RNA sequence: ACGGUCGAACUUGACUAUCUAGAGGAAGUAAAAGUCGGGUUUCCGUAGGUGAACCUGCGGAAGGAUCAUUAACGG
RNA sequence: CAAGACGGACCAGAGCGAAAGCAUUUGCCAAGAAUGUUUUCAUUAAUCAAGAACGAAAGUCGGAGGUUCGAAGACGAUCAGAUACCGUCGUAGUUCCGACCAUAAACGAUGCCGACCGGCGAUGCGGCGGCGUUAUUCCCAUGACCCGCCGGGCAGCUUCCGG
RNA sequence: AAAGUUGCUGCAGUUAAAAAGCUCGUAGUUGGAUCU
RNA sequence: CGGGGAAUCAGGGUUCGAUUCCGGAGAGGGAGCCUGAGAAACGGCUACCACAUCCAAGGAAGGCAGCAGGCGCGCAAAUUA
C-alpha cells in the first residue's frame, strides 16, 4: 500500500499531484480546455444577439416542444441555443435583439428535458423576462 | 497463385513461387492499411457533421 | 524483512489478547520493547514478564491479563512537540479518562501524562488502552 | 527468503549456549593456531580449515578456543588471500558459466543464471568497497574475469 | 575539484512539508574557493566554509578547514 | 565633422504564430407520400478473410452442470 | 524401402523451472532448490523510477525443409432470400537454423519481503529415531516396505478466529 | 465544507474501475540485537 | 506581482489574496539622456515605431495604469460636487 516513511514527503506529494489529474472535477477546473471551449468563458452571464427562434424537441419520455432561442454572443461570437423559460415568453423575444443569457444550473449539463441546451434567457432588451411575464414592465425596441 | 506444389519441383522453381506469394501479401497489407486510413478519415469527418447538427441546424422555425 | 521489532512485539501480544491466551512468546527482544512492556505493567495493563537470555537477541515471555484492549504502535516515530501532544491523545486514545500514548523523550521512555509533568516532549512510540 | 532464489530455506547451523571450551579438548590455542597455519599452506579457504578442525581435531568453534576467528588469525599472521573468499568463489562460478556460454550459444537459462551471479558479485564488490577490503578502483569485467582466478 | 583553485561542495539537508509531517532530502551545490594551503584534499570529505565578499560569479564562500573522510586514514 | 559606444527602428529572406477576403470541392440539413423497387456457450491474443463487426487457423482461458468404479495381488 | 512428424499409454491436484514453459535411451556440459552442518564472512539486506535479460501462440524478415494438419482459395452439396454450418482438395504457415517482433483470460481474474493468529493427516524432497517384514530364511552393511518426529514444498479436508 | 468521491491524519485494487508476463537492477525509501 | 492576510473548516486540509500596510515593478511601445544628493524620472527632455490635435501648408503641440468625467469594452463599478 502506502509508503509511510519519514523521508518520503517528495514521493507522497508528487504522487498526490500526479493522481489528482484523474479526478473529473479537478481536471475540468485546472487543465484550461473547458475554460477555453466554454462560450461564456468563465462568465456568470453573457449577452448576445438573437438570430432565430428554434423549437427544440424534448428528450424522449417527456414529449413537448421546448422553445429556445439561438443567440450569437457579442464578446467572442460563438453560437448558443438558449432556452426561453416561462410560457409565452418566446413572444417577447424578437429577432435581432439584445439578450442576457445565463447558465441553466448544472455548470454545463443539459438540464432535464432539453437536449444540448445549457443556457437560459434572463433579460430581453435590458428588462427581465420575470417582469415581462408578470406584467410589471414594458419592453422597448 | 493457387498451384499445388508437385514433388519434382526443385530450387529456383519453388523459390520463385514462394517469393511471388510474399509479394502478394506485401501488396495486400499495404492495401489493407490504405483502407484502414480511408475509413478512419471518413468516419471522423462524418462524426463532426453529425455533432454539428446537435449544436445547430436542428429545430422547427 | 523485519523492520521495527517493537511493532512486531505489539502485534504479537495484541493478537494473543484478542484470542484470550494466558502467555505470549515475543521475539526478538529489544531494550525499547522491554521498557515499553515495563511501562505497560506499571499501569496494570499486562502483568510480569521473563526475558529469556539466549546469547542472540533474547525472547520475552509475557503474562497476560484480559485488561488490555488494544496495543498499537505508530511508525514512523513522528516528532511530537508538547504543543501538538493534545492532537495525538485526541486521535489515538479512546477517551480523555484512560489510555496512554508511549513516547520516547530524552528523559526516558514514558507516558504522555508523565511527559506533561516533566514538561518534555519527544518522538512517539506506541499507545495502549 | 533467499536473495535470488524463490525458496525460503531454514538449513543453518546453531551454536550451543555454552561459550566455554569443552573439558575433553586438551588443545592449547597456540597449538590450534599452528595447526591452522599448517593447513593454510596447503592452500585452503577459512571455511575449509574450520571444517577440518570440526571433523578431525574436535575443535568446535575456533573463536571460542583462541578468541579470534580464522580469517583474523590468517590476516594477523599474513597468509590471508588478496580478494575475499566467497567473492572469489562467485567470480570462479561466473567464469565457468561464461565458458559454458561460449561453448554452447543457445542456453538462455544459463545466461539468466550468469546475470544473477554477476549481480551477486557486484553486490559483494560494493560491500567490500564500503568496508575498504577491495581497492576503490577495482571492477569486475567480462574479459578480465578469468585473470583474477 | 576541476576548477583552478576552487572546489564544488554540496550541502544535504531535510526539508519539512507541513501537510505530510515528513521530510525530503534536498541538496544545494556551492562553488567555493579552495586555498592551496589545503593541499591533498580528496573528494568526499567534510569541509568547513565561511562566507566572504563575492569572489566570482558564483563563488561567495571560502574554505576555512578540512577534516578528512570517515574511511580514509 | 572623423571615430567609438549604447542603441531604438527599417529592409532583405527562413522558420514560424495569428487576423481577415475568397472562385470552386465535397458534404450534411427542412421542403417533394415526386420515379423505381435462420444461426450463436462465453471469451483472450494474434494472422487472414473487402475497413470494423463477425467468421476461420494457431496457442490460451472458464468468468462452464463430476455420474459410477477404485479393500486380494498370495500356492 | 525412404521421408519428415511426433514422443502416447506410465502421466498424479506428482515434480522442476523467474516466468514463458518442460516427458524416448545414453553420454557430455554448466547451473539450481531443499535438506544436514558446534564451517566461514559479519549486515553484506527488503522493495525498487532510469535501465537490462528472458518472454506461449501468431506474425515478419533471411536459409534449409515440407509428414500430417491447415488460415487463404478452389470446387461440391444446401434454399421464399444464403454468400456462415458440412464434404473433397489445398497455398502461406505448422518443422529446423540465424535474425526480428514483445503481446495472451501471460489467471490464484488475488504485488513483493516480514511478523502474528485454530486444527487434521496424505503426499514430494532431504534429514533424525525406531520393533519388524522382505533381496529364494540373504553371511554383515545396504536397498524396498511399516510406525513415528523434523524443515522447506504443491495441494486438500475441517473450523460460529476473525473478516 | 459536505468529499474517508484524492485519503498524511483517512480510500481502494477475488468477483464492482483497478496488481505490471516474469526476473535482475542504478537512484529513492526503508533497514536485526547489542555499549550504565 | 510577492508578502502581511481572507474564505471555508472538528482534527488535518482546500481555495483565494487586482484591492487601502510593507516590498516590487510601469507610466502607449522600446531605447538614450540632462539636472540633481537622489531619477535611466515621464504632471523632464531626446529620438524611432504605434497612435493622434491645431493648422494661413511653413510648422507647432502631445501622453488620465493622478482626481472628476467621457468613449470603447463588457455580466460587471459613483459627482466634471
From Swiss-Prot, chain B:
Disease (UniProt): Inflammatory poikiloderma with hair abnormalities and acral keratoses: An autosomal recessive disorder characterized by mottled hyper- and hypopigmentation of the skin, sparse scalp hair and eyelashes, sparse or absent eyebrows, and palmoplantar keratoses.
Signal peptide per UniProt: none
Lineage: Eukaryota, Metazoa, Chordata, Craniata, Vertebrata
Tissues in which the UniProt entry reports expression: Expressed in the epidermis.
Regions crossing the membrane: none
Compartments, record wording: Cytoplasm
Gene giving rise to this polypeptide: LTV1
Role summary: Essential for ribosome biogenesis.
Source organism: Homo sapiens (Human)
Compositionally skewed regions (Basic and acidic residues) per UniProt: 6-34
Coiled-coil region: 5-61
Full-sequence range covered: 414 to 474 of 475
Family, similarity comment: Belongs to the LTV1 family.
Stated name of the protein: Protein LTV1 homolog
Region (Disordered): 1-34
From Swiss-Prot, chain C:
Keyword Transferase (UniProt): no
Source species, domain of life: Eukaryota
Modified residues (N6-succinyllysine): 87
GO BP term, example: positive regulation of cell population proliferation
GO function terms (MF aspect): RNA binding; structural constituent of ribosome
Major place of residence: cytoplasm
Cited Pfam families: Ribosomal_S8 (PF00410)
Alphabetical list of InterPro entries matching this protein: Ribosomal_uS8 (IPR000630), Ribosomal_uS8_CS (IPR047863), Ribosomal_uS8_sf (IPR035987)
Subcellular location: Cytoplasm; Nucleus, Nucleolus
SUPFAM superfamilies: Ribosomal protein S8 (SSF56047)
A GO term from the CC aspect: extracellular exosome
Alphabetically ordered keywords of this record: Cytoplasm, Diamond-Blackfan anemia, Nucleus, Ribonucleoprotein, Ribosomal protein
UniProt-listed NCBIfam families: PRK04034.1 (NF003115)
Implicated disorder: Diamond-Blackfan anemia 20: A form of Diamond-Blackfan anemia, a congenital non-regenerative hypoplastic anemia that usually presents early in infancy. Diamond-Blackfan anemia is characterized by a moderate to severe macrocytic anemia, erythroblastopenia, and an increased risk of malignancy. 30 to 40% of Diamond-Blackfan anemia patients present with short stature and congenital anomalies, the most frequent being craniofacial (Pierre-Robin syndrome and cleft palate), thumb and urogenital anomalies. DBA20 inheritance is autosomal dominant.
Subunit structure: Component of the 40S ribosomal subunit. Part of the small subunit (SSU) processome, composed of more than 70 proteins and the RNA chaperone small nucleolar RNA (snoRNA) U3.
Family according to the record: Belongs to the universal ribosomal protein uS8 family.
Name of this chain's protein: Small ribosomal subunit protein uS8
Organism: Homo sapiens
Swiss-Prot record, chain D:
Keyword terms: Acetylation, Cytoplasm, Isopeptide bond, Nucleus, Phosphoprotein, Ribonucleoprotein, Ribosomal protein, Ubl conjugation
Pfam families reported for this sequence: Ribosomal_S13_N (PF08069), Ribosomal_S15 (PF00312)
GO annotation, cellular component aspect: cytoplasm; cytosol; cytosolic ribosome; cytosolic small ribosomal subunit; extracellular exosome; focal adhesion; membrane; nucleolus
UniProt name for this protein: Small ribosomal subunit protein uS15
GO BP, sorted A to Z: cytoplasmic translation; negative regulation of RNA splicing; ribosomal small subunit biogenesis; translation
Position of the Glycyl lysine isopeptide (Lys-Gly) (interchain with G-Cter in SUMO2) cross-link: 42
Organism of origin: Homo sapiens (Human)
Post-translational modification: Ubiquitinated at Lys-26 by RNF14 and RNF25 in response to ribosome collisions (ribosome stalling).
Swiss-Prot record, chain E:
Phosphoserine: residues bearing it: 31
Disulfide bonds: none
Domain of life of the organism encoding this protein: Eukaryota
Record's keyword terms, sorted: Acetylation, Citrullination, Cytoplasm, Lipoprotein, Methylation, Nucleus, Palmitate, Phosphoprotein, Ribonucleoprotein, Ribosomal protein, RNA-binding, rRNA-binding
GO MF assignments: RNA binding; rRNA binding; structural constituent of ribosome
Protein localization: Cytoplasm; Nucleus, Nucleolus
Gene Ontology process terms (BP): cytoplasmic translation; ribosomal small subunit biogenesis; translation
Post-translational modification: Citrullinated by PADI4.
Gene Ontology cellular component list: cytoplasm; cytosol; cytosolic ribosome; cytosolic small ribosomal subunit; extracellular exosome; focal adhesion; membrane; nucleolus
Oligomer status and interactors: Component of the small ribosomal subunit. Part of the small subunit (SSU) processome, composed of more than 70 proteins and the RNA chaperone small nucleolar RNA (snoRNA) U3.
Family: Belongs to the universal ribosomal protein uS17 family.
Protein name: Small ribosomal subunit protein uS17
Amino acid at each position: 500500500g502506502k509508503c509511510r516513511g519519514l523521508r518520503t514527503a517528495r514521493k507522497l506529494r508528487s504522487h498526490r499531484r500526479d493522481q489528482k489529474w484523474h479526478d473529473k472535477q479537478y481536471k475540468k477546473a485546472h487543465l484550461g480546455t473547458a475554460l477555453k471551449a466554454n462560450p461564456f468563458g468563465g462568465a456568470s452571464h453573457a449577452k448576445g444577439i438573437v438570430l432565430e427562434k428554434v423549437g427544440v424537441e424534448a428528450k424522449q419520455p417527456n414529449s413537448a416542444i421546448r422553445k429556445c432561442v439561438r443567440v450569437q454572443l457579442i464578446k467572442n461570437g460563438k453560437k448558443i441555443t438558449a432556452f426561453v423559460p416561462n410560457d409565452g415568453c418566446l413572444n417577447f423575444i424578437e429577432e435581432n435583439d439584445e439578450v442576457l443569457v445565463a447558465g441553466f444550473g448544472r455548470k454545463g449539463h443539459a438540464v432535464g428535458d432539453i437536449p444540448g441546451v445549457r443556457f437560459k434567457v434572463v433579460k430581453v432588451a435590458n428588462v427581465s423576462l420575470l417582469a415581462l411575464y408578470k406584467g410589471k414592465k414594458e419592453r422597448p425596441r | 497463385s493457387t498451384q499445388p506444389r508437385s514433388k519434382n519441383e526443385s530450387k529456383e522453381d519453388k523459390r520463385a513461387r514462394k517469393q511471388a506469394i510474399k509479394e502478394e501479401r506485401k501488396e495486400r497489407r499495404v492495401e489493407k492499411k490504405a483502407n484502414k486510413l480511408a475509413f478512419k478519415l471518413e468516419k471522423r469527418r462524418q462524426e463532426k457533421e453529425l455533432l454539428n447538427l446537435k449544436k445547430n441546424v436542428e429545430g422547427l422555425k | 524483512v523485519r523492520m521495527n521489532v517493537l511493532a512486531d512485539a505489539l502485534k504479537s501480544i495484541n493478537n494473543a489478547e484478542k484470542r484470550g491466551k494466558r502467555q505470549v512468546l515475543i521475539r526478538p527482544c529489544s531494550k525499547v520493547i522491554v521498557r515499553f512492556l515495563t511501562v505497560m505493567m506499571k499501569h496494570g495493563y499486562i502483568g510480569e514478564f521473563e526475558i529469556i537470555d539466549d546469547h542472540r537477541a533474547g525472547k520475552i515471555v509475557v503474562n497476560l491479563t484480559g485488561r488490555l484492549n488494544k496495543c498499537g504502535v505508530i511508525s514512523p516515530r513522528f516528532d511530537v512537540q508538547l504543543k501538538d501532544l493534545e492532537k495525538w491523545q485526541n486521535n489515538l486514545l479512546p477517551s480523555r479518562q484512560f489510555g496512554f500514548i508511549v513516547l520516547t523523550t530524552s528523559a526516558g521512555i514514558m507516558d504522555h501524562e508523565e511527559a506533561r509533568r516533566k514538561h518534555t516532549g519527544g518522538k512517539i512510540l506506541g499507545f495502549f488502552f | 527468503g533467499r536473495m535470488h532464489a524463490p525458496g525460503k530455506g531454514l538449513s543453518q547451523s546453531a551454536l550451543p549456549y555454552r561459550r566455554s571450551v569443552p573439558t575433553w579438548l586438551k588443545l592449547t590455542s597456540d597449538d590450534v593456531k599452528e595447526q591452522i597455519y599448517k593447513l593454510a599452506k596447503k592452500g585452503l579457504t577459512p571455511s575449509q580449515i574450520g571444517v577440518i578442525l570440526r571433523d578431525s581435531h574436535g575443535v568446535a568453534q575456533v573463536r571460542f578456543v583462541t578468541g579470534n576467528k580464522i580469517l583474523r588469525i590468517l590476516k594477523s599472521k599474513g597468509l590471508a588471500p588478496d580478494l575475499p573468499e566467497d567473492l572469489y568463489h562467485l567470480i570462479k562460478k561466473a567464469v565457468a558459466v561464461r565458458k559454458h556460454l561460449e561453448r554452447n550459444r543457445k542456453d538462455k537459462d544459463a545466461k539468466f543464471r550468469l546475470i544473477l551471479i554477476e549481480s551477486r558479485i557486484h553486490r559483494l564488490a560494493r560491500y567490500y568497497k564500503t568496508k575498504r577490503v577491495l581497492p576503490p578502483n577495482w571492477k569486475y569485467e567480462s574479459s578480465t574475469a578469468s585473470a583474477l582466478v | 575539484m576541476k576548477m583552478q583553485r576552487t572546489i564544488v561542495i554540496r550541502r544535504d539537508y531535510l526539508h519539512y512539508i507541513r501537510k505530510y509531517n515528513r521530510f525530503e532530502k534536498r541538496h544545494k551545490n556551492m562553488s567555493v574557493h579552495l586555498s592551496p594551503c589545503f593541499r591533498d584534499v580528496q573528494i568526499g570529505d567534510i569541509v568547513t566554509v565561511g562566507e566572504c565578499r563575492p569572489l566570482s560569479k558564483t563563488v561567495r564562500f571560502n574554505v576555512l578547514k578540512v577534516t578528512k573522510a570517515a574511511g580514509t586514514k
